[PDB]
Design a protein around this ligand. Sequence first.
Ligand code: FES
Ligand SMILES: [K+]
Ligand SMILES: [K+]
Ligand SMILES: [K+]
Ligand SMILES: [K+]
Ligand SMILES: [Mg+2]
Ligand SMILES: [Mg+2]
Ligand SMILES: [Mg+2]
Ligand SMILES: [Mg+2]
Ligand SMILES: [Mg+2]
Ligand SMILES: [Mg+2]
Ligand SMILES: [Mg+2]
Ligand SMILES: [Mg+2]
Ligand SMILES: [Mg+2]
Ligand SMILES: [Mg+2]
Ligand SMILES: [Mg+2]
Ligand SMILES: [Mg+2]
Ligand SMILES: [Mg+2]
Ligand SMILES: [Mg+2]
Ligand SMILES: [Mg+2]
Ligand SMILES: [Mg+2]
Lengths: 52, 168, 86, 108, 119, 110, 77
Amino acid sequence: KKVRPRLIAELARRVRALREQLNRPRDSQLYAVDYETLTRPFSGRRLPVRAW
Amino acid sequence: PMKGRFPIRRTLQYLSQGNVVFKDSVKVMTVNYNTHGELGEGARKFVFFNIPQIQYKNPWVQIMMFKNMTPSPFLRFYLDSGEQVLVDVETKSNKEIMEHIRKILGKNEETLREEEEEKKQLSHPANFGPRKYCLRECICEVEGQVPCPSLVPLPKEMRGKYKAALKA
Amino acid sequence: LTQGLFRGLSRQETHQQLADKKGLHVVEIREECGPLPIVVASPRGPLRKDPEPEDEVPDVKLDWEDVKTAQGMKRSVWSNLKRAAT
Amino acid sequence: ATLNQMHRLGPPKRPPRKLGPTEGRPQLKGVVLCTFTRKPKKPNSANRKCCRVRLSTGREAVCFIPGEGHTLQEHQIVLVEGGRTQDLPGVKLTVVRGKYDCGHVQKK
Amino acid sequence: KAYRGGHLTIRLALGGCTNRPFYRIVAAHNKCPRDGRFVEQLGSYDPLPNSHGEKLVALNLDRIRHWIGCGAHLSKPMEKLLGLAGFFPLHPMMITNAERLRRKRAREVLLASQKTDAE
Amino acid sequence: VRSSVHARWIVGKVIGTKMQKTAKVRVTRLVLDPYLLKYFNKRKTYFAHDALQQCTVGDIVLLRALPVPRAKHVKHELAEIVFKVGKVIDPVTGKPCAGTTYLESPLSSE
Amino acid sequence: RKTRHDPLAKSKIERVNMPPAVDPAEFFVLMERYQHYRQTVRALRMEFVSEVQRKVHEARAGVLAERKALKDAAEHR
RNA sequence: CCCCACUAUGCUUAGCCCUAAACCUCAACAGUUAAAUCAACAAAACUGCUCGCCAGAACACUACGAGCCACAGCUUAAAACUCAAAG
RNA sequence: AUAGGUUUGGUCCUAGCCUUUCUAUUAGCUCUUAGUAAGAUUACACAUGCAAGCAUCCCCGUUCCAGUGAGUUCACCCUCUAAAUCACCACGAUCAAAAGGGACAAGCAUCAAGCACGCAGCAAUGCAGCUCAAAACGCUUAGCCUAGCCACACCCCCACGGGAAACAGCAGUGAUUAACCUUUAGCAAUAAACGAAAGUUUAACUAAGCUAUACUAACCCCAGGGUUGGUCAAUUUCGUGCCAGCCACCGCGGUCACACG
Ligand code: FES
Ligand SMILES: [K+]
Ligand SMILES: [K+]
Ligand SMILES: [K+]
Ligand SMILES: [K+]
Ligand SMILES: [Mg+2]
Ligand SMILES: [Mg+2]
Ligand SMILES: [Mg+2]
Ligand SMILES: [Mg+2]
Ligand SMILES: [Mg+2]
Ligand SMILES: [Mg+2]
Ligand SMILES: [Mg+2]
Ligand SMILES: [Mg+2]
Ligand SMILES: [Mg+2]
Ligand SMILES: [Mg+2]
Ligand SMILES: [Mg+2]
Ligand SMILES: [Mg+2]
Ligand SMILES: [Mg+2]
Ligand SMILES: [Mg+2]
Ligand SMILES: [Mg+2]
Ligand SMILES: [Mg+2]
């Protein structure tokens, strides 16, 4: 009943959370828009046709 | 045949004949009886016939027996509140003991029927499902309703094979 | 098998012999007839006035084969098979 | 025994059922290696057509060709099955007629 | 089982065989399969008319009122079954879908009339 | 009052007292054999906390579950010593007894 | 169904779902119906919620329940 | 196998070895002689309670493993293949 | 089991094997229709296509459904108590993870010792214990207790990192095995996601396609397979001559074969 520890599962969890706080994208990158294709270059997703 | 003396004791029909269903307070039951002596005769018969019946109805109650520790037999119960119930069972038959503890610590017939009645409401007859839980699996088993296609083929107008063909 | 069959079928006690032996009424209880007591045999001699002492637990030797069946434990793919009329 | 002894032991432990030459499988695919004949044990006497095959599991056992006459050669493919050859001791496999290279016994 | 987030929902669980559907009303987690595990069965619905030409619908109102008071949601088809009964109000789209049908049928009466009149 | 321990009240027998302020108790329960339909004693060991170290090997004791385990295996505490080894007092009469005999006649105190 | 790591199809790359047309009359009438229907149902839900809270408190802390817990404790003594 | 001769050994002392048809092949405690006494033979048939042991033959007083002052040993003790009998 | 056959020159006892019943898989021979259910052998490798989007931008969702059975006492009860639903504060309810206690597969004792597995104390630190023939420790095997649950998601238990470039999603293919379903349609129903909503999307699902694997029903025309010494229902005539061959058990065949063809 003694669970075998998983240390790599906790190490990566801390590293991921840390990098998400140090490499976090800014509002300038996230909410940018190309006004010709009307796509956010960060994700390459088109906006809805009613917002164009 | 079945080994041992009085083999009927080792039967489900005999273990379910006990009428002593303790309450929630009772936690431990300790029996102290003497192997010899005319006075302790009933206590010995109570350990030989009824303890199996009591433990079968109260499986979460600890029962511990001690031999020849005192000059006289007695019973002692330990409740959850910390109270102890001493019961001198000297010069008494096994039935008197079985009837005496049922009056001071056992449930009555009114408290038992209620519990059973609650269970009956767990199996609703209207529900449909497997035979283990429900009486009927589907509603095609009800006369008047559309039968199962496995037994009675449906009309060609009610099958999606022809509805598509008729439409196209 | 044959010498024993005839042996047990001849040493069986009827309802009349039982009544005469114990001087009591032999009453038959049937589920189909409800609680109606049916007297199948009565003693010819003096009927006893005292009843038999009711026994809390009977000291009768049982058969594991019968007890195991009554408890839904005797599994067999050869019992209760559909056979011809006999 | 006693009730205390029967409780300590527990339910009878059924011996693990042993597997046959097919390793608990209906049939098996093998390649022919040799084609010899063996003499049966008493009270019988004959020359029974047998063949040594290498099964797909890796073993290399002896099999019996049923029927009158066969045209089995080395490197051919045959399907085998169970069934003891009572006359031949130690022969537990039988070739299947009409499957793969093995061809149905010619009539008469 | 434990689902991340989610909630309880009173929906329909399809049953029956091919071309013979039979729904059974149940209260189940939102992420659980359609015909998978459920908390309680609260009714049944037989779409196909019976010999008498009527669709049967069972509802355990006493229990439907219990789960709605414990945080359970409702599916659109199930909200249209409670409106047909009088337990809930008529769903807005049950009303608008009827108006669309009226205008549609009135639009077909014109063409039918014109053909018989003009021709 | 509510505790995280399964067994709240249990009676046992002290088998060992080699740990500081701790008594090792053996608890027996009747368990039904499904096949033979007979009850047999299934024993189990429990660790009890004895503040005064008054327990003795061979005496019957009563254990009370603690609110939370004070240690890894200690979950109960010594509630009272039911039968002291060799010095049991008859609960029915309150007199000392050595087996099935009274050491002090009950008639002394009427 | 797909996962976050699975890629997208090449037939949906140049796909644009145009929103449906709007009937000004029906759209406004239907926009009020949901407003009332959802207000009538929010009240019903609150009613049923009060009934589940009551029974529970009643069961553990009720007149009849506490009138029987004392009778069982008095009969025990 | 019969006759003669002679040795280890049989004996004492100090240690080891720990086996037998070590079988009266019939376990210990208590109790019974009536009922169905009872397959056969043998040393009549049974009850209560408890421990130990056995589950087709052969492979097998074997192999491996482990333990032992035992080193060609003792104890514990299987499996594969084979038979439709063995007893 | 209502039992039966078989040890022998013969009898009784004991005993094993086998037969008779009911299912599943594969093989041989054979095969008309309709409805329904079910449907790789392999955690080996995979061409192509599709399976997650919604929406006035943000968020939400893609952590679900679906799939597999590699590994395997995390699945149940109690206590306590997060997240989530009940529009919202609160309430308590519902649901439920982590933590604590208890319970929980099979075989092997030729696995009998494990080797730090304990307790006290605020701490310092002290004591020397803890488990086990009532089976500890250990090996091997196996998905389970099926309205469903547990576990896994190419491999290194994990996944920062590395090997390395992944169908155990649908259809389909290679290899492999005795084991072999279409590289269909549609979101109309239900369910799920998103949206205030009309609605959009979904290889979930629904409706079809294929297969005597099974159930039900039917058919003017349309039946084959096995068996025929005894157990065990049922053989005429030839050929063969301990040769060729047959048998589930007992056995048949040596020139009169109800047992081979
Ligand atoms: S089972 Fe009810 S329709 Fe097939
Ligand atoms: K012969
Ligand atoms: K002897
Ligand atoms: K959105
Ligand atoms: K598995
Ligand atoms: Mg000499
Ligand atoms: Mg000598
Ligand atoms: Mg001797
Ligand atoms: Mg002996
Ligand atoms: Mg002895
Ligand atoms: Mg043997
Ligand atoms: Mg020897
Ligand atoms: Mg040896
Ligand atoms: Mg050796
Ligand atoms: Mg799943
Ligand atoms: Mg948990
Ligand atoms: Mg070995
Ligand atoms: Mg496995
Ligand atoms: Mg289909
Ligand atoms: Mg002839
Ligand atoms: Mg012939």
